[PDB]
Amino acid sequence: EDPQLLVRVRGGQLRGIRLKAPGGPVSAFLGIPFAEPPVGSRRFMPPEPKRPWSGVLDATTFQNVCYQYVDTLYPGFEGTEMWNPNRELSEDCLYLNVWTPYPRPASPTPVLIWIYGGGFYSGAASLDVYDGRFLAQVEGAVLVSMNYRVGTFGFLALPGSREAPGNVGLLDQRLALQWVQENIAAFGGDPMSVTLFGESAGAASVGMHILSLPSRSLFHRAVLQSGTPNGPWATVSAGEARRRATLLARLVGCPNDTELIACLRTRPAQDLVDHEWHVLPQESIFRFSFVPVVDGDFLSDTPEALINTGDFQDLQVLVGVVKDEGSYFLVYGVPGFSKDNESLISRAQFLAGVRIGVPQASDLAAEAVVLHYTDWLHPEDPTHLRDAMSAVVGDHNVVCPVAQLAGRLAAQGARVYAYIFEHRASTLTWPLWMGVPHGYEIEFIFGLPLDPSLNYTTEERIFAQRLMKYWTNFARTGDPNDPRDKSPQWPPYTTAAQQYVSLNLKPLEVRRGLRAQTCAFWNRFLPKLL
Amino acid sequence: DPMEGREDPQLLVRVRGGQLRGIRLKAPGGPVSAFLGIPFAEPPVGSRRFMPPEPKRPWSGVLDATTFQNVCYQYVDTLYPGFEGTEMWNPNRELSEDCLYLNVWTPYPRPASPTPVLIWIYGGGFYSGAASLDVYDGRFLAQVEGAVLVSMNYRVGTFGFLALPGSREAPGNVGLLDQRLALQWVQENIAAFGGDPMSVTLFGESAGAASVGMHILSLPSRSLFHRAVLQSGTPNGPWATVSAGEARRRATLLARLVGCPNDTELIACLRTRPAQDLVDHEWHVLPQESIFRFSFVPVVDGDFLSDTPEALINTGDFQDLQVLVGVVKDEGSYFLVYGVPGFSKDNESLISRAQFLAGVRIGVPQASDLAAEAVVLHYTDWLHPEDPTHLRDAMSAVVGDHNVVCPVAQLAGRLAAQGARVYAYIFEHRASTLTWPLWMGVPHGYEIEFIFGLPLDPSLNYTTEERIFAQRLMKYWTNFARTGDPNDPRDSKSPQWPPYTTAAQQYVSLNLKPLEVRRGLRAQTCAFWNRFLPKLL
């Protein structure tokens, strides 16, 4: 009968579990329902608050992963499998997890809320790399992570209808935020200091909470790791969402919006998953069929309009990228790339790869990209063309949208801190040519190197500690710098000086201009070519 | 010649048109022979204006060949009166349409055996220039390297390049024809001076380099030389040529501006106008505000130039050609003070970014709004986009790259890809005696005085290192003339100057330090200019 694993929330009692972290125990409350299961008639619909329960709800184990495509490109390969579901799939998946220190915090404690990535078609809060025990134990943080619907279940939209209004995965996330506001105090959390953090689609999601007014009253700070609400992949127009929904409907035999949606609700989850990739316009890496939609409700306008016209005076933001944002996506559909070769390519392959990675570029824009990224001392060298292909995809999808976001935010009142993450995990099983790929900073932020049984180096586990206190310092104060502190200071990102830091084994290094020229090419010149 | 027996027997030479007597000049290391003001054409006056040159008909007696002749009629710069920086390029003899003369420097006494010949073609935008300028003095190359050096006058401005293509009274390119006639003169007569007609190297700067390039691309000229040096100029590029239609348009406009209304009619009327009237109006013809842009230049006539220089360098076979090409560090600087708002030789020419945009519009006047903004974005410093120094230097680079550096990079590339042995350089030393402001770096044309070896004259106040540098460059150039290779065949100790190739793109820096080999002649920027920007039209 451990009383600090017994907690009462607005819907009833829960029992958590005492977990062992390297430095001591933590309290974990796993699989807490925050919504009615979005099954049957609730499919495609906004989430409803979980109805109260009797007795003591067991909150000691992770719940089901939201129904989604499972990656099978490299079966049994750690590099891919580490991101695959580690619990069974279900549409009944709207649950969240809470990590707290053991015993529960003496005073109200800053809350970090993790929103996983996975292109809005995949992901889960139960993955090993999202383990909250280390941040909770070492930094005394309260950490919350929620599941949200992905793929069709989360983002299939027929805009204007009420059975499939779109953005319900974002609404799942928001409902979880509300749940934290109402209940986190019972766990020792401070509802008045809430920081959202996420990577990839999760970073984009965080951004969208920044740009959606009802969400704004549910947090105070934000961290966007390798993803943005603006850019080419995170959103679609209402018309295009309708088109894609209708196409998927016909691919599954369906058939008036009401009729079509009802027929879709009759379909088994796996039929929808089986067809969800056969709807997208062009051949494309870094591009997903069902994503947040500019609905004029959750998103009152396009993200770029909203970041261009928004007032972000009372917002603090931490943003950044890894060294090789594009590498990971080359092995997923660009001819000439694989995890097994060193993926050396010809310049014909490079041209074609540009056409793929940049599908809605005109012939002229595509050629502009090609010329801009060519090294004219070695325009035929296969290594240079490979790295260039990587840089094209990375810069276009992450680095330049991030640079633009940081610029707008800083220019319009926000306190911004920017980083580039440059350390390659010693335990990384992806080929060396992929450098520091997408998403491989996460394990360090969460403090996984603090676990001796994971075979990280010693420097990696000091590095991990550094990053944990950067992130938790930011949660606590809106500032990654240690308030009483020796390492160089991390200066705010501004439009004038454009300062950002390198995160690696060496001490903080301040640099200026986040790929300034290249991102001037992407954000200032290339738009003028349409 | 009643007095031959009492005169220097070492200065009497016979050429195809008769006898001439030169003069013994003193160079720092010893005497040289100079034969100045030799007519190679009939005076292109009266009814001969705008017409192809006619070979000089033979004369009786002994021609005095001891003094420089008249300078071809041209605009004289008076922007900075008494300023060395401009006056050193101004005419140093009186102006005349009777100006088709050439000059020959040789050792004294004249070489025992046949000696490789260097032929200088001056620059000046095809509107100015003269072979008699101090900076083109051949005495140093003749004395120190034992060279035979020839330099000719050619008609510039309207007199040289006004064209009504198709007509036979003004066919165009006659200034280039003047040059070619001089080349022929060399072929027939240079042996009388101890020169070798079978080893002739052309070299020139600016419009002179463009001229040399055009001789490479024109078949009749090809049998008149063997090697070429192009300093800071190319036959291709935006300024060196015009189309037949545009040349007709400009001639017609100038005609109308001077009170002249059938081609024959119009040309005759132009021939009745005084030379100065033509000079006074020649600048009032060109379309837009333009630095580095001239009204009367070589015309793509389908005759001298059988096609555009670009087409000809794209389809040409150059396998038995050796070429030496290069640029100075700051090709654009000199032209900023000549018509871009905000620039002067007296202030530091710091400019605003609005000024930068306007200046881009002026320096690249063909360019559409989109191309212009592409240029602006490409040259912007995104860490300090408002910094006036950076914007000034950027303006300079735009003009230099657009007009010289990238046309050169292209030429070198095409030539190397199509068989030619190419050697490439960038000249980086700023003359200690240079009177242009420091911000202009190493401006256009200030490598010339080093090539010709002027620092060997003690009375010119160059440093010692500058005199050694000068000697190095003279030896590079004359080695190239001699062998098609700037390298000294028996110097084991000094760094080698490697050929420029499309694979390695090697070139050297020329300065007080030993040869340094670099790779990629402004490769990314010139890819922008030569590969991307054309596609935006």
PDB file of C-alpha atoms in Angstrom, chain B residues 40-235:
ATOM      1  CA  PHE B  40      51.408  50.484 -91.669  1.00  0.00           C
ATOM      2  CA  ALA B  41      48.337  51.940 -93.372  1.00  0.00           C
ATOM      3  CA  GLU B  42      47.203  54.808 -95.536  1.00  0.00           C
ATOM      4  CA  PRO B  43      45.788  57.558 -93.345  1.00  0.00           C
ATOM      5  CA  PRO B  44      42.102  56.687 -92.867  1.00  0.00           C
ATOM      6  CA  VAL B  45      40.913  60.241 -93.465  1.00  0.00           C
ATOM      7  CA  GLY B  46      38.314  61.967 -95.599  1.00  0.00           C
ATOM      8  CA  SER B  47      36.540  59.387 -97.723  1.00  0.00           C
ATOM      9  CA  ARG B  48      38.396  56.590 -95.876  1.00  0.00           C
ATOM     10  CA  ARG B  49      36.675  57.291 -92.560  1.00  0.00           C
ATOM     11  CA  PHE B  50      34.723  54.228 -91.339  1.00  0.00           C
ATOM     12  CA  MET B  51      36.442  52.205 -94.081  1.00  0.00           C
ATOM     13  CA  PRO B  52      38.810  49.198 -93.885  1.00  0.00           C
ATOM     14  CA  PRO B  53      42.464  50.162 -93.725  1.00  0.00           C
ATOM     15  CA  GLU B  54      44.546  50.202 -96.932  1.00  0.00           C
ATOM     16  CA  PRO B  55      48.179  49.018 -96.745  1.00  0.00           C
ATOM     17  CA  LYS B  56      50.691  51.847 -96.595  1.00  0.00           C
ATOM     18  CA  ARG B  57      52.115  52.506-100.048  1.00  0.00           C
ATOM     19  CA  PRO B  58      55.908  52.689-100.251  1.00  0.00           C
ATOM     20  CA  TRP B  59      57.763  55.954 -99.649  1.00  0.00           C
ATOM     21  CA  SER B  60      60.989  57.435-100.966  1.00  0.00           C
ATOM     22  CA  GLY B  61      63.959  58.266 -98.776  1.00  0.00           C
ATOM     23  CA  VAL B  62      64.504  57.549 -95.092  1.00  0.00           C
ATOM     24  CA  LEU B  63      61.506  57.617 -92.818  1.00  0.00           C
ATOM     25  CA  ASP B  64      62.154  59.203 -89.444  1.00  0.00           C
ATOM     26  CA  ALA B  65      61.159  56.506 -87.003  1.00  0.00           C
ATOM     27  CA  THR B  66      62.457  58.132 -83.833  1.00  0.00           C
ATOM     28  CA  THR B  67      59.273  59.610 -82.288  1.00  0.00           C
ATOM     29  CA  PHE B  68      55.757  58.391 -81.429  1.00  0.00           C
ATOM     30  CA  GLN B  69      53.057  59.410 -83.916  1.00  0.00           C
ATOM     31  CA  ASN B  70      49.584  60.844 -83.432  1.00  0.00           C
ATOM     32  CA  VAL B  71      47.013  59.202 -81.153  1.00  0.00           C
ATOM     33  CA  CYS B  72      43.772  57.966 -82.759  1.00  0.00           C
ATOM     34  CA  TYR B  73      40.993  60.478 -82.305  1.00  0.00           C
ATOM     35  CA  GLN B  74      39.105  59.909 -79.045  1.00  0.00           C
ATOM     36  CA  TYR B  75      37.442  61.264 -75.913  1.00  0.00           C
ATOM     37  CA  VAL B  76      39.895  62.661 -73.341  1.00  0.00           C
ATOM     38  CA  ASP B  77      39.108  62.083 -69.654  1.00  0.00           C
ATOM     39  CA  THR B  78      38.978  65.267 -67.551  1.00  0.00           C
ATOM     40  CA  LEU B  79      37.041  64.035 -64.493  1.00  0.00           C
ATOM     41  CA  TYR B  80      40.066  64.579 -62.232  1.00  0.00           C
ATOM     42  CA  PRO B  81      42.351  67.206 -63.804  1.00  0.00           C
ATOM     43  CA  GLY B  82      46.021  66.767 -62.867  1.00  0.00           C
ATOM     44  CA  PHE B  83      45.309  63.415 -61.193  1.00  0.00           C
ATOM     45  CA  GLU B  84      47.879  60.769 -62.110  1.00  0.00           C
ATOM     46  CA  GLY B  85      45.335  57.938 -61.883  1.00  0.00           C
ATOM     47  CA  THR B  86      43.453  59.222 -64.903  1.00  0.00           C
ATOM     48  CA  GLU B  87      46.127  61.185 -66.767  1.00  0.00           C
ATOM     49  CA  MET B  88      48.398  58.178 -67.134  1.00  0.00           C
ATOM     50  CA  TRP B  89      45.805  56.702 -69.492  1.00  0.00           C
ATOM     51  CA  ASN B  90      45.150  59.885 -71.470  1.00  0.00           C
ATOM     52  CA  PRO B  91      46.705  60.562 -74.891  1.00  0.00           C
ATOM     53  CA  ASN B  92      50.342  61.659 -74.725  1.00  0.00           C
ATOM     54  CA  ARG B  93      50.469  62.817 -78.380  1.00  0.00           C
ATOM     55  CA  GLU B  94      48.108  64.972 -80.361  1.00  0.00           C
ATOM     56  CA  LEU B  95      44.822  63.563 -81.653  1.00  0.00           C
ATOM     57  CA  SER B  96      44.291  62.800 -85.320  1.00  0.00           C
ATOM     58  CA  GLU B  97      42.408  60.533 -87.672  1.00  0.00           C
ATOM     59  CA  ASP B  98      45.830  60.078 -89.281  1.00  0.00           C
ATOM     60  CA  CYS B  99      47.026  57.691 -86.581  1.00  0.00           C
ATOM     61  CA  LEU B 100      47.669  54.247 -88.057  1.00  0.00           C
ATOM     62  CA  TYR B 101      51.305  53.835 -86.980  1.00  0.00           C
ATOM     63  CA  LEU B 102      53.183  51.155 -85.095  1.00  0.00           C
ATOM     64  CA  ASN B 103      56.216  50.929 -82.846  1.00  0.00           C
ATOM     65  CA  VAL B 104      59.015  48.366 -82.563  1.00  0.00           C
ATOM     66  CA  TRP B 105      61.458  47.842 -79.692  1.00  0.00           C
ATOM     67  CA  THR B 106      64.475  45.520 -80.027  1.00  0.00           C
ATOM     68  CA  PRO B 107      67.783  45.067 -78.233  1.00  0.00           C
ATOM     69  CA  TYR B 108      70.697  47.311 -79.260  1.00  0.00           C
ATOM     70  CA  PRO B 109      72.254  46.090 -81.374  1.00  0.00           C
ATOM     71  CA  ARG B 110      69.489  44.054 -83.033  1.00  0.00           C
ATOM     72  CA  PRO B 111      69.335  40.309 -82.242  1.00  0.00           C
ATOM     73  CA  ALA B 112      71.818  37.976 -83.990  1.00  0.00           C
ATOM     74  CA  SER B 113      69.271  35.149 -84.379  1.00  0.00           C
ATOM     75  CA  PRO B 114      65.455  35.174 -84.799  1.00  0.00           C
ATOM     76  CA  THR B 115      63.749  36.268 -81.612  1.00  0.00           C
ATOM     77  CA  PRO B 116      60.156  35.566 -80.430  1.00  0.00           C
ATOM     78  CA  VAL B 117      57.896  38.577 -80.966  1.00  0.00           C
ATOM     79  CA  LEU B 118      55.417  40.061 -78.527  1.00  0.00           C
ATOM     80  CA  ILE B 119      52.632  42.213 -79.930  1.00  0.00           C
ATOM     81  CA  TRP B 120      50.762  44.529 -77.545  1.00  0.00           C
ATOM     82  CA  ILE B 121      47.166  45.543 -78.156  1.00  0.00           C
ATOM     83  CA  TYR B 122      46.054  48.335 -75.855  1.00  0.00           C
ATOM     84  CA  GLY B 123      42.750  48.576 -74.025  1.00  0.00           C
ATOM     85  CA  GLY B 124      40.453  51.512 -73.300  1.00  0.00           C
ATOM     86  CA  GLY B 125      36.952  50.169 -73.893  1.00  0.00           C
ATOM     87  CA  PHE B 126      37.281  50.463 -77.671  1.00  0.00           C
ATOM     88  CA  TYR B 127      36.753  54.240 -77.236  1.00  0.00           C
ATOM     89  CA  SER B 128      40.261  55.227 -76.127  1.00  0.00           C
ATOM     90  CA  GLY B 129      43.902  54.188 -75.823  1.00  0.00           C
ATOM     91  CA  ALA B 130      47.272  54.564 -77.519  1.00  0.00           C
ATOM     92  CA  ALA B 131      50.432  52.535 -78.038  1.00  0.00           C
ATOM     93  CA  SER B 132      52.603  55.486 -77.042  1.00  0.00           C
ATOM     94  CA  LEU B 133      51.622  55.588 -73.372  1.00  0.00           C
ATOM     95  CA  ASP B 134      54.437  55.385 -70.829  1.00  0.00           C
ATOM     96  CA  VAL B 135      52.952  52.303 -69.215  1.00  0.00           C
ATOM     97  CA  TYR B 136      53.395  50.481 -72.569  1.00  0.00           C
ATOM     98  CA  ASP B 137      57.111  51.287 -72.919  1.00  0.00           C
ATOM     99  CA  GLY B 138      58.798  48.297 -74.575  1.00  0.00           C
ATOM    100  CA  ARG B 139      62.370  49.208 -73.654  1.00  0.00           C
ATOM    101  CA  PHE B 140      62.529  47.086 -70.485  1.00  0.00           C
ATOM    102  CA  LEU B 141      61.274  43.866 -72.030  1.00  0.00           C
ATOM    103  CA  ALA B 142      63.660  44.439 -74.966  1.00  0.00           C
ATOM    104  CA  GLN B 143      66.690  45.188 -72.793  1.00  0.00           C
ATOM    105  CA  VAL B 144      66.236  42.634 -70.017  1.00  0.00           C
ATOM    106  CA  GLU B 145      64.605  39.730 -71.834  1.00  0.00           C
ATOM    107  CA  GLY B 146      65.991  40.490 -75.288  1.00  0.00           C
ATOM    108  CA  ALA B 147      62.473  40.690 -76.656  1.00  0.00           C
ATOM    109  CA  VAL B 148      61.167  42.115 -79.905  1.00  0.00           C
ATOM    110  CA  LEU B 149      58.048  44.085 -78.977  1.00  0.00           C
ATOM    111  CA  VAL B 150      55.532  45.615 -81.380  1.00  0.00           C
ATOM    112  CA  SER B 151      52.579  47.838 -80.527  1.00  0.00           C
ATOM    113  CA  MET B 152      50.147  49.360 -82.921  1.00  0.00           C
ATOM    114  CA  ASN B 153      47.631  52.139 -82.948  1.00  0.00           C
ATOM    115  CA  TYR B 154      44.085  51.198 -84.000  1.00  0.00           C
ATOM    116  CA  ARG B 155      41.031  53.351 -84.562  1.00  0.00           C
ATOM    117  CA  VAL B 156      38.654  53.575 -81.596  1.00  0.00           C
ATOM    118  CA  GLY B 157      35.209  55.006 -81.004  1.00  0.00           C
ATOM    119  CA  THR B 158      33.082  55.770 -84.019  1.00  0.00           C
ATOM    120  CA  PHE B 159      36.106  55.964 -86.317  1.00  0.00           C
ATOM    121  CA  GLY B 160      36.975  52.388 -85.448  1.00  0.00           C
ATOM    122  CA  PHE B 161      33.644  50.706 -84.759  1.00  0.00           C
ATOM    123  CA  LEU B 162      30.696  52.662 -86.121  1.00  0.00           C
ATOM    124  CA  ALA B 163      28.948  50.182 -88.339  1.00  0.00           C
ATOM    125  CA  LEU B 164      26.040  49.893 -90.717  1.00  0.00           C
ATOM    126  CA  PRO B 165      26.270  46.128 -91.239  1.00  0.00           C
ATOM    127  CA  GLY B 166      25.835  45.129 -94.849  1.00  0.00           C
ATOM    128  CA  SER B 167      26.998  48.465 -96.205  1.00  0.00           C
ATOM    129  CA  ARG B 168      30.334  48.722 -97.908  1.00  0.00           C
ATOM    130  CA  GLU B 169      31.138  52.271 -96.761  1.00  0.00           C
ATOM    131  CA  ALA B 170      30.927  51.291 -93.062  1.00  0.00           C
ATOM    132  CA  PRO B 171      31.164  47.492 -92.678  1.00  0.00           C
ATOM    133  CA  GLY B 172      32.256  47.612 -89.041  1.00  0.00           C
ATOM    134  CA  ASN B 173      35.164  46.147 -87.101  1.00  0.00           C
ATOM    135  CA  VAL B 174      37.694  48.333 -88.977  1.00  0.00           C
ATOM    136  CA  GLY B 175      39.682  48.924 -85.780  1.00  0.00           C
ATOM    137  CA  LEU B 176      40.153  45.152 -85.536  1.00  0.00           C
ATOM    138  CA  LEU B 177      41.163  45.242 -89.195  1.00  0.00           C
ATOM    139  CA  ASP B 178      43.766  47.920 -88.310  1.00  0.00           C
ATOM    140  CA  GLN B 179      45.132  45.510 -85.756  1.00  0.00           C
ATOM    141  CA  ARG B 180      45.155  42.672 -88.305  1.00  0.00           C
ATOM    142  CA  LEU B 181      46.944  44.769 -90.918  1.00  0.00           C
ATOM    143  CA  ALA B 182      49.605  45.535 -88.342  1.00  0.00           C
ATOM    144  CA  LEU B 183      49.847  41.789 -87.666  1.00  0.00           C
ATOM    145  CA  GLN B 184      50.444  41.206 -91.365  1.00  0.00           C
ATOM    146  CA  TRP B 185      53.033  43.975 -91.379  1.00  0.00           C
ATOM    147  CA  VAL B 186      54.821  42.109 -88.637  1.00  0.00           C
ATOM    148  CA  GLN B 187      54.667  38.872 -90.617  1.00  0.00           C
ATOM    149  CA  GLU B 188      56.316  40.480 -93.616  1.00  0.00           C
ATOM    150  CA  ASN B 189      58.785  42.864 -91.992  1.00  0.00           C
ATOM    151  CA  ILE B 190      59.722  41.858 -88.469  1.00  0.00           C
ATOM    152  CA  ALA B 191      62.596  39.643 -89.699  1.00  0.00           C
ATOM    153  CA  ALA B 192      64.387  42.815 -90.812  1.00  0.00           C
ATOM    154  CA  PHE B 193      64.490  43.745 -87.103  1.00  0.00           C
ATOM    155  CA  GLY B 194      65.690  40.313 -85.939  1.00  0.00           C
ATOM    156  CA  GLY B 195      62.205  39.121 -85.050  1.00  0.00           C
ATOM    157  CA  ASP B 196      60.850  35.659 -85.725  1.00  0.00           C
ATOM    158  CA  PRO B 197      57.541  35.768 -87.680  1.00  0.00           C
ATOM    159  CA  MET B 198      57.105  32.087 -86.817  1.00  0.00           C
ATOM    160  CA  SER B 199      56.948  32.821 -83.072  1.00  0.00           C
ATOM    161  CA  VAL B 200      54.444  35.661 -82.509  1.00  0.00           C
ATOM    162  CA  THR B 201      52.587  36.167 -79.216  1.00  0.00           C
ATOM    163  CA  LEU B 202      49.666  38.602 -78.885  1.00  0.00           C
ATOM    164  CA  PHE B 203      49.015  40.179 -75.523  1.00  0.00           C
ATOM    165  CA  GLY B 204      46.603  42.856 -74.377  1.00  0.00           C
ATOM    166  CA  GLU B 205      44.610  44.242 -71.499  1.00  0.00           C
ATOM    167  CA  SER B 206      40.822  45.066 -71.241  1.00  0.00           C
ATOM    168  CA  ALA B 207      39.475  45.823 -74.794  1.00  0.00           C
ATOM    169  CA  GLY B 208      42.927  44.762 -75.975  1.00  0.00           C
ATOM    170  CA  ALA B 209      42.428  41.326 -74.445  1.00  0.00           C
ATOM    171  CA  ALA B 210      38.997  41.201 -76.070  1.00  0.00           C
ATOM    172  CA  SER B 211      40.745  42.129 -79.376  1.00  0.00           C
ATOM    173  CA  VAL B 212      43.271  39.331 -78.949  1.00  0.00           C
ATOM    174  CA  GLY B 213      40.411  36.935 -78.224  1.00  0.00           C
ATOM    175  CA  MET B 214      38.690  38.043 -81.386  1.00  0.00           C
ATOM    176  CA  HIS B 215      41.831  37.334 -83.413  1.00  0.00           C
ATOM    177  CA  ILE B 216      41.754  33.840 -81.935  1.00  0.00           C
ATOM    178  CA  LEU B 217      38.143  33.514 -83.174  1.00  0.00           C
ATOM    179  CA  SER B 218      38.680  34.954 -86.644  1.00  0.00           C
ATOM    180  CA  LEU B 219      40.299  32.740 -89.304  1.00  0.00           C
ATOM    181  CA  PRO B 220      42.284  35.251 -91.349  1.00  0.00           C
ATOM    182  CA  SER B 221      43.983  36.430 -88.145  1.00  0.00           C
ATOM    183  CA  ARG B 222      44.863  32.918 -87.049  1.00  0.00           C
ATOM    184  CA  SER B 223      47.711  32.527 -89.525  1.00  0.00           C
ATOM    185  CA  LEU B 224      49.343  35.709 -88.116  1.00  0.00           C
ATOM    186  CA  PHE B 225      50.243  34.577 -84.598  1.00  0.00           C
ATOM    187  CA  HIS B 226      50.891  31.494 -82.511  1.00  0.00           C
ATOM    188  CA  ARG B 227      50.121  32.337 -78.875  1.00  0.00           C
ATOM    189  CA  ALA B 228      47.876  34.686 -76.931  1.00  0.00           C
ATOM    190  CA  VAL B 229      47.672  36.480 -73.620  1.00  0.00           C
ATOM    191  CA  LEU B 230      44.341  37.939 -72.430  1.00  0.00           C
ATOM    192  CA  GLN B 231      44.650  40.249 -69.441  1.00  0.00           C
ATOM    193  CA  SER B 232      41.306  41.224 -67.799  1.00  0.00           C
ATOM    194  CA  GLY B 233      39.220  40.949 -70.951  1.00  0.00           C
ATOM    195  CA  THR B 234      37.516  38.495 -73.263  1.00  0.00           C
ATOM    196  CA  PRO B 235      35.854  38.438 -76.685  1.00  0.00           C
TER     197      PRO B 235
END
